[PDB]
Amino acid sequence: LGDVELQKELNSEYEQLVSDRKFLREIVFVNGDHNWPLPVNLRRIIQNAQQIFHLDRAKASDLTIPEIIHGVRDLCKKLFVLRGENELIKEAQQNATSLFQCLVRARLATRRILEEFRLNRDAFEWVLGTIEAQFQRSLVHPGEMV
Amino acid sequence: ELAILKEERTTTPYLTKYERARILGTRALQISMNAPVLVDIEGETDPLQIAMKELSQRKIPLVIRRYLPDGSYEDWGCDELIVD
Amino acid sequence: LIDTAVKTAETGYIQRRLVKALEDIMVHYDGTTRNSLGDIIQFLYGED
Amino acid sequence: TPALTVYLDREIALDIEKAKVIQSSIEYTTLKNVTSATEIYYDPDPTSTVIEEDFDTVEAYFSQSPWLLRLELDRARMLDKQLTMNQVADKISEVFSDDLFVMWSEDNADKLIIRCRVIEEDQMLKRIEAHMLDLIALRGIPGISKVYMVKHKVSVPDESGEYKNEELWALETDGINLAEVMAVPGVDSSRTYSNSFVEILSVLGIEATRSSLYKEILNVIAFDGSYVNYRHMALLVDVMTSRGYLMAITRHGINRADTGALMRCSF
Amino acid sequence: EDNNRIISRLWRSFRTVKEMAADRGYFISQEEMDQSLEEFRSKICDSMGNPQRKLMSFLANPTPEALEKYSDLGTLWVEFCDEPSVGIKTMRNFCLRIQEKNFSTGIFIYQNNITPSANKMIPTVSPAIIETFQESDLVVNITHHELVPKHIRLSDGEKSQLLQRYKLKESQLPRIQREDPVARYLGLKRGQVVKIIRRSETSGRYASYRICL
């Protein structure tokens, strides 16, 4: 309670979420549709994490807010559809994963992680690693006769 | 001239399905021609299964040369590409 | 019965033409979708 | 079945009378569309007449060739298209400025009539009559033969940000003229759409052509509830629009590429 | 009546021409942008109400940003002609006036048609450039249409960067016709590359590139 050097990060999270809200509502999906085919099922990841790490008894969670925010921020910068240090490579990489980043941030929000899913640190790290690996597995292979 | 230095290699670090299939086929054909086997053969005698065992243990001595559309290529040893 | 007997030829012709039009298109190691001439069809496959 | 979907401006898009006025402005009527039956009378003296109905009209209209054209205008046809005698006579004079002199009975008259004079001419009158009945326009964009008052259940956010349906009039049509309808006032010029993507290419460019092509293919496929993943139809429309122009899936499209001879011969 | 409609259509076309010029990089005064129908009618029409199309012809200079970016951006001349049909005579006068005051680009907006004999003088008037648009075409600005995403011409250095990033040749790019309505609206010359950012339902945002033939 009462902290400020953390309320800054909370406000940054909420402003990123509002940016996503505005972007999706005004550019991508203007008619409101929000159920779209996307890689990596996050519902199933979260429930598998709950099963594996036994999230019953609503135990006191040792998962701090700054670690949640920085974990999701680092994860969003680890989903590689294109590899390279070029600048157009970076632009295309961010354009490639904008919708999926919107999904990952709509699900792994601080209030949601703490209240709705009640994850501890282990389940959280497992969710991030599983998103990493399954996204790397969802990519098309070179050589496909698409 | 067309080879790429191991630092600026910008293709996927993951073995694709086609690379894995062809690598396994080639290794199986080689072993069926009385080639030396790098793994310790414990129970299995089928060359394809031996080749799979070698692929899992990163002991297949082959190289994939990935040609780009401009004619250049990147070289990746099988032991440094990541197998799912 | 007439529909089943008669439309299958138009459908098979359509699928043959589509296959001949799109047969030379492959995802390359840089992510692009190019034809046999090397021309770009999509800069990233499926845009994702 | 060519067709436009003409989205109206919002002020018009909610009111029905205004939308119907825009419909009347956009729809195409020709002199054929409001004409019942044309005669040809020999009227040797312009100031008099051999007929017994319109003598009083021309005696009130007075205080060249003796060949007269007496065309009749049905009542309900005028009523339904908001057309009166004044605009029709003006339109005839618009393309027959001074090589024709037009008389027209009044609108309340028990017989709705038009009379014209040329300035052997029993066949130039026939040629002029045919060309009028087949080329005189009254109002609207040529190429739009019918217009419909359609209702669209658009989903838009509320003032609380929550999505709510909203009941808007819009126009559907028989025929296609994208450029001229896009200009008509009262139309949302930034949202008019055509089901002919060749028209889109000629009017809006190649990227809009790609969008229209995807919309048509998605409509045809998803008609019956089938779902094809996006990337396949995206690839198909990207191959068809990659050169800057529409490449058909035919020999005339496939075999005009620059690929090898053996590929083209194999097809 | 119909005079009001003619004046309104002409005013819409003039606004489209000014939006075209500003989009292409030339500086247009913010007050001449918001030119209203009645104020336009005041400055153009007569006592009889018919409009003088010789007053709309203006002169546009490159905005400094579009000079720092597009170094090949000279001075623009825009003329609304009065002759409905345009022949080799009028094109001769227009080309003479364009070369006479070293105008780089001359936009010649006509009403009815431009005859092929006149049309032949368009490419033979180097080093100046002459483009023509028809007034009927200019009534609606098509870059405002929802299906038309925003096109942005690349500069020479950025085009080189695009070609090297993809290890590409010019002929291996998606293409746009010089007669494309958005290439025509943008004054694209052969070899110049537009960048087209557009909506993507699978990724959110996707950047496309086309070379103008």
XYZ file of C-alpha atoms in Angstrom, chain C residues 2-47:
46
model
C -27.410 -34.468 -62.997
C -25.743 -31.865 -60.783
C -23.466 -34.479 -59.225
C -22.596 -35.942 -62.635
C -22.001 -32.637 -64.425
C -20.440 -30.191 -61.946
C -17.485 -32.408 -61.005
C -15.727 -31.628 -64.296
C -15.899 -27.861 -63.755
C -14.708 -28.345 -60.178
C -11.785 -30.562 -61.190
C -10.776 -28.089 -63.884
C -10.879 -25.245 -61.349
C -8.700 -27.138 -58.896
C -6.213 -28.066 -61.631
C -5.929 -24.418 -62.677
C -5.477 -23.272 -59.071
C -2.769 -25.891 -58.523
C -0.909 -24.883 -61.691
C -1.154 -21.214 -60.693
C 0.153 -21.723 -57.143
C 2.450 -24.756 -57.527
C 5.775 -22.870 -57.514
C 5.258 -20.888 -54.292
C 7.382 -21.739 -51.260
C 8.301 -20.231 -47.910
C 12.002 -19.399 -47.953
C 14.499 -19.386 -45.111
C 14.228 -15.592 -44.744
C 10.464 -15.917 -44.198
C 9.338 -14.577 -47.566
C 6.849 -16.240 -49.889
C 8.267 -16.276 -53.420
C 7.562 -17.992 -56.729
C 10.056 -19.753 -59.013
C 11.208 -16.448 -60.552
C 12.227 -15.310 -57.058
C 9.505 -12.651 -57.053
C 7.911 -11.819 -53.713
C 4.269 -12.770 -53.215
C 4.133 -12.021 -49.477
C 6.884 -10.561 -47.329
C 5.816 -12.791 -44.439
C 3.679 -15.896 -44.880
C 0.081 -15.341 -43.827
C 1.367 -11.961 -42.595
